[PDB]
Every structure is written in structure tokens, then in C-alpha cells.
Amino acid sequence: MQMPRRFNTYCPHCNEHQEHEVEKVRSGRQTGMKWIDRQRERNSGIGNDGKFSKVPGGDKPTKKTDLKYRCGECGKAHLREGWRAGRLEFQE
Amino acid sequence: TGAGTPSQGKKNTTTHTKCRRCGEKSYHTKKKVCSSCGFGKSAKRRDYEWQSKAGE
Amino acid sequence: GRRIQGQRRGRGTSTFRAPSHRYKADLEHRKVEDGDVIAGTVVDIEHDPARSAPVAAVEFEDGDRRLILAPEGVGVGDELQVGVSAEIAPGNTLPLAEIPEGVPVCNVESSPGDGGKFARASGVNAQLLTHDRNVAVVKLPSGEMKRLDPQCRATIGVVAGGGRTDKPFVKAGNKHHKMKARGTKWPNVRGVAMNAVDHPFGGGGRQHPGKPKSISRNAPPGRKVGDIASKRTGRGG
Amino acid sequence: ARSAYSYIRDAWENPGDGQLAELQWQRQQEWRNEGAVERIERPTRLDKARSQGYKAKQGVIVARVSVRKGSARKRRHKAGRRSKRQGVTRITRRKDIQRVAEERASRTFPNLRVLNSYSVGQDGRQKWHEVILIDPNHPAIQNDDDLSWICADDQADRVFRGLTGAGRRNRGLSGKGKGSEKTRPSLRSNGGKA
RNA sequence: GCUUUACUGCAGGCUGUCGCUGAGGACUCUCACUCCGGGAGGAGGACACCGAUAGCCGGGCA
RNA sequence: ACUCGUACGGUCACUGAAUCCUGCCCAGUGCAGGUAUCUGAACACCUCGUACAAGAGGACGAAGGACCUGUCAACGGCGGG
RNA sequence: AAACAUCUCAGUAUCGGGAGGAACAGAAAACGCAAUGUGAUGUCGUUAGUAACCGCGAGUGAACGCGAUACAGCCCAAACC
Numbered sequence: 123m124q125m126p127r128r129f130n131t132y133c134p135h136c137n138e139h140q141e142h143e144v145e146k147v148r149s150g151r152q153t154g155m156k157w158i159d160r161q162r163e164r165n166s167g168i169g170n171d172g173k174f175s176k177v178p179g180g181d182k183p184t185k186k187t188d189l190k191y192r193c194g195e196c197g198k199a200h201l202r203e204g205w206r207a208g209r210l211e212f213q214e
Numbered sequence: 215t216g217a218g219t220p221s222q223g224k225k226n227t228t229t230h231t232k233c234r235r236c237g238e239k240s241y242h243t244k245k246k247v248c249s250s251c252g253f254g255k256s257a258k259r260r261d262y263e264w265q266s267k268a269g270e
Numbered sequence: 271g272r273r274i275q276g277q278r279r280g281r282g283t284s285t286f287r288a289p290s291h292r293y294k295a296d297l298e299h300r301k302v303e304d305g306d307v308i309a310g311t312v313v314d315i316e317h318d319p320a321r322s323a324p325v326a327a328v329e330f331e332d333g334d335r336r337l338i339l340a341p342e343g344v345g346v347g348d349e350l351q352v353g354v355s356a357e358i359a360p361g362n363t364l365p366l367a368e369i370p371e372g373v374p375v376c377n378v379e380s381s382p383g384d385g386g387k388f389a390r391a392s393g394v395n396a397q398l399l400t401h402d403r404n405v406a407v408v409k410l411p412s413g414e415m416k417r418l419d420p421q422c423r424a425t426i427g428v429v430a431g432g433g434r435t436d437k438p439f440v441k442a443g444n445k446h447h448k449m450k451a452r453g454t455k456w457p458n459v460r461g462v463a464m465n466a467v468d469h470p471f472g473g474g475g476r477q478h479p480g481k482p483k484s485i486s487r488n489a490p491p492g493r494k495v496g497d498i499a500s501k502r503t504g505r506g507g
Numbered sequence: 508a509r510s511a512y513s514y515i516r517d518a519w520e521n522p523g524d525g526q527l528a529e530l531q532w533q534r535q536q537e538w539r540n541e542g543a544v545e546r547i548e549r550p551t552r553l554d555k556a557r558s559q560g561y562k563a564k565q566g567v568i569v570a571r572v573s574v575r576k577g578s579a580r581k582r583r584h585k586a587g588r589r590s591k592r593q594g595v596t597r598i599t600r601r602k603d604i605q606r607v608a609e610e611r612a613s614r615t616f617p618n619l620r621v622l623n624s625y626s627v628g629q630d631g632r633q634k635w636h637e638v639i640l641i642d643p644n645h646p647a648i649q650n651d652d653d654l655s656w657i658c659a660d661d662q663a664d665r666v667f668r669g670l671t672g673a674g675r676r677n678r679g680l681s682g683k684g685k686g687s688e689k690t691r692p693s694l695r696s697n698g699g700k701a
Numbered sequence: 702g703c704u705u706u707a708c709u710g711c712a713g714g715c716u717g718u719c720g721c722u723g724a725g726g727a728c729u730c731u732c733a734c735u736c737c738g739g740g741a742g743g744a745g746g747a748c749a750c751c752g753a754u755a756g757c758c759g760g761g762c763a
Numbered sequence: 764a765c766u767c768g769u770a771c772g773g774u775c776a777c778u779g780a781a782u783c784c785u786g787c788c789c790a791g792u793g794c795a796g797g798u799a800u801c802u803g804a805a806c807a808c809c810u811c812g813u814a815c816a817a818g819a820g821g822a823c824g825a826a827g828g829a830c831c832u833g834u835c836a837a838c839g840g841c842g843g844g
Numbered sequence: 845a846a847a848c849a850u851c852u853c854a855g856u857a858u859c860g861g862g863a864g865g866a867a868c869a870g871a872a873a874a875c876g877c878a879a880u881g882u883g884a885u886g887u888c889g890u891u892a893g894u895a896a897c898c899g900c901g902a903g904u905g906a907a908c909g910c911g912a913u914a915c916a917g918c919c920c921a922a923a924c925c
């Protein structure tokens with residue numbers, strides 16, 4: 123489906139309607155220093171490694187929208203529930 | 215030839231004999247080892263914890 | 271499953287050992303001080319249980335009585351020489367260096383003084399081709415060009431017993447008697463004819479290897495059966 | 508002033524440098540040709556031996572022992588095991604090589620008791636340690652104020668019960684506080700979890 | 702119990718790397734080390750063997 | 764162990780005396796060889812990050828794979844129209 | 845663990861070696877009720893199923909301290925001879 127790059131809506135930060143810009147959330151890189159990262163190294167050794175021997179699951183036929191909404195005046199973003207959309211293309 | 219009665223007749227070999235060290239008829243005269251006390255195998259006396267119940 | 275026959279072998283149990291207590295002697299070249307001042311007289315020709323070929327008993331000048339890997343054409347009374355100055359005659363032993371290029375030799379040493387390693391079987395011979403100050407080139411029975419230290423000793427002539435392979439065994443009984451003189455388990459039961467538990471090829475209603483026979487060099491023992499690391503198979507192409 | 512000993516000591520801080528480097532290169536050639544336990548007239552690292560209790564006296568013996576380098580020489584499981592207990596290659600033993608060396612030395616000299624030991628190098632395939640052993644039955648020792656303690660009955664076969672300096676360290680008894688909850692007073696009394 | 706391109710692992714083999722290990726992206730040398738030789742000595746040589754680790758193969762085995 | 768053995772050897776497999784013979788197929792799988800380029804781990808090295816370290820990225824790249832070739836008395840195959 | 849691989853059963857069964865009448869531990873490179881504080885080590889009660897671990901599942905699981913028992917502190921290496 124189609125969707126406007128910018129449009130007026132409520133900004134929970136300014137607490138009033140203002141223009142926002144919609145952006146698909148880009149994945150941020152991992153640091154490899156989170157607790158889970160250290161548990162994988164502490165608990166992995168000889169033989170099977172329990173949960174750390176499992177491999178990536180499947181995929182749902184369609185994913186939900188994963189967007190950021192940035193307020194055009196205070197520069198802050200807020201998240202919203204997403205909805206299943208086979209495709210999301212912005213207009214302009 | 216059956217493995218039972220007919221094959222029992224060929225048994226006239228002497229293996230286990232009175233042991234010099236412990237007195238039991240367990241000294242294998244062919245191996246020269248006592249299966250009861252270990253004579254011929256070890257200076258220490260043959261012994262195992264599984265010869266009795268674990269907590270006893 | 272269970273270990274395959276090739277694995278039972280390595281344990282060296284009686285079933286797989288050679289009847290060594292029946293073998294005659296280690297036909298290694300004599301060790302000479304130097305000069306070649308060593309000569310002996312062929313005192314007798316004997317049968318060698320370990321190689322199905324004849325061997326000659328020699329009595330050396332200094333009083334040593336030793337069996338020798340005899341070439342073809344050696345008989346009682348004949349005098350043999352072993353040394354750097356030995357005469358270039360069939361039956362004499364000397365370093366490749368002293369040997370004229372183009373002369374068939376046998377019982378060629380791999381490393382000077384080891385006693386001989388190559389060309390010792392019935393009717394075979396290495397062929398000395400090239401000389402040099404650093405390398406003597408010999409063509410072995412398999413046809414491969416081998417580079418050897420010119421100090422490696424050899425016997426002039428081909429090994430006795432040639433053609434032993436020309437006559438067929440005809441009977442299983444004849445194969446049997448020969449096998450009893452070797453370190454080998456015989457007769458041979460085909461892998462395909464065994465149960466799956468006993469061989470990679472066992473199992474299945476009708477007999478057939480349920481897999482390709484060309485196996486990788488890296489395969490572990492128990493799995494390395496069939497055609498080992500074959501570069502090719504068949505007769506075609 | 509500095510003792511002559513401090514010089515032997517200082518040399519051994521960098522066994523791979525200086526004269527010591529050349530000495531080791533020479534010595535090991537001969538050591539590789541010797542047995543598993545060779546009694547020696549004098550310690551190779553005098554400062555260390557004297558520091559550990561050695562004395563030039565009757566009843567004091569020193570022996571060099573070599574052991575194969577590396578991990579455990581373990582036999583793979585012939586019966587059923589869960590992945591966890593199938594390992595064979597990366598498993599190492601719980602006693603360090605110095606301790607294995609002290610025990611072989613003490614077995615060679617059944618009448619002597621291990622006093623201490625130290626390292627004298629290694630090459631790519633083995634390690635060497637010298638072990639100080641004491642004759643608890645010789646009066647020169649029974650009358651020594653610094654060593655007679657090792658003559659007591661309860662010191663018999665001390666090395667086989669972990670009562671050595673190397674034994675105690677390997678048992679995790681160094682620290683007196685944090686980290687020693689399961690090592691003191693014994694590994695066994697703590698259920699073998701240390 | 703058996704099978705395999707079932708799951709997960711383990712031996713084993715191949716391969717790189719570090720230690721053993723020295724002197725002057727291709728090279729010479731000898732001194733460790735290896736092999737041959739009764740011995741002198743010869744062959745080889747910082748490689749190989751061995752310890753450690755990494756990648757690939759891996760129903761041979763669990 | 765084989766082996767007091769050395770290719771006229773001995774190991775690993777298949778077929779199963781003699782006689783007349785043994786066609787076509789290398790795409791898949793297996794084995795083997797080669798390989799400009801591609802891909803390909805760790806240590807060392809370089810950049811960023813940390814007064815250090817964790818970590819992120821880079822350059823290099825072995826076997827292996829991609830790719831090419833050989834091979835069926837190698838697993839096997841030789842249909843429908 | 846209602847399967848099962850990490851985990852559990854369990855450092856249990858069993859095996860190798862070794863001492864004693866008891867063993868082992870033990871006079872701080874401790875503790876960290878953080879203090880102007882405690883003062884070798886076992887053990888008992890408690891701290892506590894607490895902190896911590898863990899397909900964060902099932903399960904596993906201390907310590908400091910405190911109240912007791914009993915109390916005990918010393919000897920080398922080196923410097924200088």
C-alpha cells in the first residue's frame with residue numbers, strides 16, 4: 123500500500139498536532155557486549171550448547187509496519203502499533 | 215551337535231584350583247591368576263566396593 | 271555397527287600375523303668395512319617360505335654363513351663378491367656408483383647400508399639408468415623413476431623365480447597352501463555379502479553397495495572401503 | 508649487598524635470554540637423552556631450591572623429572588554418552604604437570620618424602636621440574652630444626668595426598684577469602700565442586 | 702538393533718596459524734630436531750614429528 | 764599388525780571355471796585433478812572505538828566450495844511423445 | 845525436565861593412589877555489617893532456599909556477619925656474619 127512521507131498528526135512530545143515524517147525503522151548494529159553475548163560464550167563448550175545450538179526460526183507471510191514518526195518541530199520520534207502490509211511505499 | 219548335554223561331555227580340563235594365597239578353588243592354573251583374591255595378578259588383595267550394597 | 275575386517279587386522283592377532291617363527295632369514299646385504307675384500311662361496315640353494323622364491327646360502331672368507339637374496343643364474347660353487355671393488359658380475363653386490371649404466375639390479379637399498387628394500391620379489395629387477403656425483407637414477411619394477419644416493423648398494427641381475435605368476439592356481443586348495451605361508455586372512459567374503467552391521471556395503475534385499483564405491487582419502491577407518499581415493503575407475507575413457 | 512643467589516634468580520626470569528638461553532639450548536640436548544627421573548648432585552636453580560627448603564646436607568636429594576607436554580591422554584567413550592560427556596580432545600586433567608612430576612619422583616624414591624619442586628624449562632614436547640626429596644630416616648635430618656617436621660608419620664606419602672606446595676595451590680587453597688568457599692578445608696569435604 | 706543428504710554432537714583426515722625454532726614473497730646456511738649407518742660419517746633441516754588452535758570433510762561412532 | 768614382506772608385492776573392493784562377448788550415458792551423486800576470477804577461519808597486521816580492554820570494520824587468504832576437466836568392470840540410468 | 849540435546853540425577857555409583865587414630869585446614873597479598881570496625885583454621889546453629897545460576901524451564905545454590913564449641917601461635921629464604 124501507499125503512504126505519505128509527511129503528514130499532520132499528534133506529537134506526544136509537543137502535546138499538539140504538528141507535521142511528522144515517517145521512516146521505516148533501520149536495524150541498529152549490535153555491540154556484542156550485551157549480557158546475552160557473554161552467556162553464549164560462558165555456556166558454549168563441548169557437545170550441544172542448549173539454547174545456543176538452536177538456529178533462526180521462520181517467517182510470517184506478511185510483516186507489520188515498522189515505522190518511526192518524527193515531529194517536524196521538536197525533532198523527536200514516537201512509535202505506533204503496526205499493521206500487516208505486504209508492501210509499504212511512501213508518496214514523495 | 216547340540217550346545218547342551220552332548221557338549222558337556224568334552225569337559226575334562228582343569229582350570230580353577232585351590233589357591234595358595236587365599237584357599238579358594240579359584241586359582242586358574244592356565245592363567246596362573248586367582249579370580250577370587252587376585253594372587254598372580256596383584257600384591258594387594260582383590261577387592262571391590264560393588265561386592266556389597268552401596269550404602270553398606 | 272561392528273568393526274570391519276580391515277580393523278580387526280591392525281590388532282595383529284594370530285589370525286592376521288605372518289608365520290614368522292617359520293621364516294628363514296632377513297636377506298640384507300652384508301656390512302663391509304671397505305675395500306671389497308669380502309668374498310664368499312655359494313654353499314647351497316634353498317627355498318624361502320616368505321617369498322616363494324629361492325635363496326642362496328653363502329660362506330664368506332671371514333667365516334660368516336648367511337642366506338642371500340639370490341638373482342637368477344646363481345649356483346653352488348660360484349663365488350660372490352660384496353664391496354666397492356667387487357667385479358661387475360651377476361650375483362655380486364656393490365654401490366650403484368660402481369655399477370655401469372644400463373645394468374639390471376635387485377635388492378636396491380633405499381638408504382645406504384639399510385640392507386636393500388626395492389626389487390626383491392620373484393623375477394623382478396630395477397634398471398640403473400643414470401649416474402652422477404650426487405644422484406643415481408633407477409627405474410623400479412613399477413616403472414617409476416627413483417632418485418637414489420649413489421652410495422646405495424644393489425645386486426647385479428634380476429631376482430630368481432621369474433614367471434611364478436604365469437601359472438594359474440587352478441584350485442582353491444593351492445591358494446590355501448600359499449596363504450598359510452603369509453600374514454593374510456583368506457578366503458575373502460565380499461562386503462556386499464555381509465550384514466549392514468558388518469560393512470558399509472552390507473544389507474539390502476539383493477546384494478549391491480547402497481553407495482558409490484570411490485571413497486575419500488580423508489575417510490576414517492571403518493569407512494574407507496571400496497575404491498580408495500580412485501583417480502578414475504573402469505577400463506573406458 | 509645483592510647475594511650471588513639473586514643473580515641465578517634474575518637469570519631465570521627470562522630463561523630465553525642471555526647466557527641462560529644458550530645453557531638451556533645445550534642442556535636440553537642431554538636431558539632429552541636421560542630417563543624420566545634422574546637424580547642430580549646439585550640443584551640447577553640454587554636460589555630457588557634454598558628458598559624452598561633445600562640444604563647441602565645428608566638426607567637431602569634432588570631429582571629432575573620430565574613429563575610429556577599437553578592435555579589429557581583420554582580414551583573415548585565406548586558406551587552411551589550425552590553430547591556433553593563425549594568430548595575427548597579438549598579435556599584436560601585436574602592436576603598440573605608439576606604435580607605429576609612430583610609423584611613420579613616420589614615413586615622412584617619410595618623411602619623419601621617430597622619437600623618441594625620447581626620448573627627448569629621445557630621444549631616443544633615435554634616439561635622438566637627438579638624435585639627436592641628428604642630422607643626422614645637419616646639422623647642428620649631428624650636433628651635438623653628446619654626439616655625434622657617432615658619426619659612425622661602423618662607426612663608419609665604427603666605428595667600423594669596433595670600436601671605439597673604445588674599440591675595445595677592446584678587444590679585452590681591460595682586465597683583465604685573470596686573464591687575459596689569450595690576449596691577449604693578440602694575439595695572432597697566440599698563435595699568436589701572447587 | 703539397523704539406515705540415511707533427520708536433529709545434535711564426537712573421534713579421524715586434510716588445511717592455516719602459534720610454540721618447539723636457530724644464523725645469514727622469493728632464497729641460502731647449520732646448530733636444535735628427524736632418518737640411514739656397527740662406526741666414522743651420510744641424508745634431510747628450521748621443514749617434518751609433537752603440543753595448541755582455527756576452517757573444511759566427517760553414520761566411522763554416540 | 765602387515766613385515767625375516769618390497770610392485771611377479773600387499774592393501775581395498777567388485778564379478779565368480781572354461782567359451783563367445785561385455786553397447787550408449789559424466790546431467791545428478793561419489794572420487795580425482797585443475798583453477799584467471801568469486802567465496803573462504805584463526806593468529807599477526809591496519810582503521811575506528813577504549814588513557815587500556817571488550818567491540819565494530821579492513822587488508823591478506825589455506826584447504827574447501829563456486830567454476831572447468833577426467834572417470835561407469837563408480838553409485839546408478841538407457842523413458843513418454 | 846511428564847519427549848529431549850544445556851540443565852538434572854551428581855562430582856553420586858564405581859575405579860586408581862595414599863595417610864592417621866582421626867584426617868584435611870590454619871596464623872591474611874583476609875574481611876569490606878565501609879568502619880574511629882573484625883582479626884589463623886575446622887565444626888555446630890543461623891544468615892537462607894536469601895545473593896547468584898538456569899531451554900531465565902525443570903531445577904541448582906553460597907558467602908561476609910552473628911550465637912556457639914575449642915582456642916595458639918610460630919619456623920625458613922635473603923640482607924649482616
Ligand SMILES: [Cl-]
Binds near residue numbers: 146187189210
Ligand atoms: Cl515497514
Ligand SMILES: [Cl-]
Binds near residue numbers: 448
Ligand atoms: Cl597370491
Ligand SMILES: [Cl-]
Binds near residue numbers: 613619620663664
Ligand atoms: Cl612424598
Ligand SMILES: [Cl-]
Binds near residue numbers: 882
Ligand atoms: Cl567484621
Ligand SMILES: [K+]
Binds near residue numbers: 589
Ligand atoms: K542424561
Ligand SMILES: [Mg+2]
Binds near residue numbers: 296297298
Ligand atoms: Mg632380508
Ligand SMILES: [Mg+2]
Binds near residue numbers: 285449450451452454
Ligand atoms: Mg594363516
Ligand SMILES: [Mg+2]
Binds near residue numbers: 459
Ligand atoms: Mg569372495
Ligand SMILES: [Mg+2]
Binds near residue numbers: 464
Ligand atoms: Mg545375509
Ligand SMILES: [Mg+2]
Binds near residue numbers: 469470
Ligand atoms: Mg555400517
Ligand SMILES: [Mg+2]
Binds near residue numbers: 477478
Ligand atoms: Mg551384484
Ligand SMILES: [Mg+2]
Ligand atoms: Mg635459626
Ligand SMILES: [Mg+2]
Ligand atoms: Mg631408527
Ligand SMILES: [Mg+2]
Ligand atoms: Mg546412530
Ligand SMILES: [Mg+2]
Ligand atoms: Mg555374485
Ligand SMILES: [Mg+2]
Ligand atoms: Mg555367488
